[PDB]
Design an enzyme around this catalytic site. Structure first.
Site, short mmCIF file in Angstrom:
data_model
loop_
_atom_site.label_atom_id
_atom_site.label_comp_id
_atom_site.label_asym_id
_atom_site.label_seq_id
_atom_site.Cartn_x
_atom_site.Cartn_y
_atom_site.Cartn_z
N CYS A 90 0.89 -1.17 0.00
CA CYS A 90 0.00 0.00 0.00
C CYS A 90 0.91 1.20 0.00
O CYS A 90 0.62 2.21 -0.64
CB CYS A 90 -0.93 -0.01 1.26
N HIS A 250 -1.23 1.40 7.50
CA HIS A 250 -1.71 1.31 6.13
C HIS A 250 -1.65 2.64 5.44
O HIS A 250 -2.08 3.64 6.00
CB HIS A 250 -3.14 0.81 6.16
N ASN A 270 -9.09 3.87 -0.88
CA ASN A 270 -8.32 2.73 -0.39
C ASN A 270 -7.72 1.98 -1.63
O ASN A 270 -7.90 2.41 -2.77
CB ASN A 270 -9.23 1.84 0.42
#
Ligand SMILES: *[C@@H]1O[C@H](CO)[C@@H](O[C@@H]2O[C@H](CO)[C@@H](O[C@@H]3O[C@H](CO)[C@@H](O)[C@H](O)[C@@H]3O)[C@H](O)[C@H]2NC(C)=O)[C@H](O)[C@H]1NC(C)=O
Ligand SMILES: *[C@@H]1O[C@H](CO)[C@@H](O[C@@H]2O[C@H](CO)[C@@H](O)[C@H](O)[C@H]2NC(C)=O)[C@H](O)[C@H]1NC(C)=O
Length: 308
Positions: A90, A250, A270
């Site tokens: 990520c 994240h 996301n």
């Protein structure tokens, strides 16, 4: 570790405690995700100068809501949702996505996708590939070394779904565990010439005002937050943490802000594809560094290719 993260009872608790300000859902796409898997999706691990705003920037009365896709409507990368797949990348994917957005909002190039593969595989300074890495060093790598586009080196791992019967026909994530790919120096098809893309400066952001102001003038950028188990169950509304254990850091792409029934929020892209959350997006409480979200952003300015 091969135990499911979610239970019906856990979800019911979350929804009592969150007072209906956001909705958690048990039998969503994450119903069966295990602890090992949920942890692997969070790949932030572990310096840039602080952004300074000019007098002009600082005095702009920022509107009470703002959405990057509406403000730069001719920039087609902004509304695209990525899929990091079965890899803790990520940190690189949210960086590459925002870099692509910035080539359009600042860098004079309407539609280039920056390769998250190249960054993931070749930036060894940044971390350990699919086992995680550091958002700030990613931006620094975009300045010192630069990145090819995904036309040159496409993201090497396919979309995968946590559903057993995926709406989009994606294969199940559980059938994959990927390791960091090899760094390459030519495009996958070697007859496509290598075009290198670079920024000239990188910088860090901190706090609600920095973020709003950076987003307003320059567009999307990368932030990080702490992921707890209740986040896995997010379905809609403005998230804030009420239960669940810590699962890791994240990175995500910040794209907007607003207010919903009195609750200020950040709109965020996301990287778990469009099956998750609100078509790939989530809202999260703004103003009180919810789960650390306002503790540090990373951004930079792309250098326009060629010359005039
Ligand atoms: C740099 O180029 C290398 C070498 O071509 C790319 O590696 C290759 O990546 C693909 C995609 O993961 C791998 O595909 C897999 O192949 C195995 C065995 O054939 C197959 O069982 C899987 O279903 C899948 O098709 C391929 O194995 C792999 N090759 C090597 C030597 O690892 C690499 O991804 C490129 N680097 C970047 C950052 O894109
Ligand atoms: C999570 O796992 C359970 C159980 O495997 C899934 O339920 C199965 O779903 C398939 C297809 O929908 C059915 O044919 C089976 O009858 C179900 N088995 C049981 C025991 O319920 C459930 O679909 C999975 N959930 C998600 C979102 O993937």
């Amino acid at each position: 570790e091969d135990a499911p993260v979610l239970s019906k009872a856990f979800v019911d608790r979350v929804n009592r405690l969150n007072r209906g300000i956001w909705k958690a859902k048990y039998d969503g796409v994450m119903q069966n995700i295990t602890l090992r898997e949920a942890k692997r999706l969070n790949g932030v691990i572990k310096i840039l100068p602080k952004r300074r705003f000019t007098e002009e920037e600082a005095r702009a009365p920022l509107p009470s809501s703002f959405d990057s896709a509406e403000a730069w409507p001719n920039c087609p990368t902004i509304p695209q949702i990525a899929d990091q797949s079965a890899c803790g990348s990520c940190w690189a994917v949210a960086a590459a996505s925002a870099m692509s957005d910035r080539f359009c909002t600042m860098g004079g190039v309407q539609d280039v996708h920056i390769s998250a593969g190249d960054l993931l595989a070749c930036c060894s300074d940044c971390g350990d590939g699919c086992n995680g890495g550091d958002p700030d060093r990613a931006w620094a790598y975009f300045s010192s070394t630069g990145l090819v586009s995904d036309y040159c080196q496409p993201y090497p791992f396919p979309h995968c779904s946590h559903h057993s019967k995926s709406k989009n026909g994606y294969p199940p994530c559980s059938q994959f565990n990927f390791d960091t790919p090899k760094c390459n120096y030519t495009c996958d098809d070697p007859t496509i010439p290598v075009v290198n893309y670079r920024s000239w400066t990188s910088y860090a952001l901190q706090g609600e005002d920095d973020y709003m102001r950076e987003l307003f003038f320059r567009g999307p950028f990368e932030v990080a937050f702490d992921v707890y188990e209740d986040f896995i169950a997010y379905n809609s509304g403005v998230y804030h943490h009420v239960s669940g254990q810590y699962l890791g850091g994240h990175a995500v792409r910040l794209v907007g802000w607003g207010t919903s029934n009195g609750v200020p929020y950040w709109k965020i892209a996301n990287s778990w594809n469009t099956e998750w959350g609100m078509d790939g997006y989530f809202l999260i409480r703004r103003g009180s560094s919810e789960c650390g979200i306002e503790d540090g952003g990373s951004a930079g300015i792309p250098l326009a290719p060629n010359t005039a």
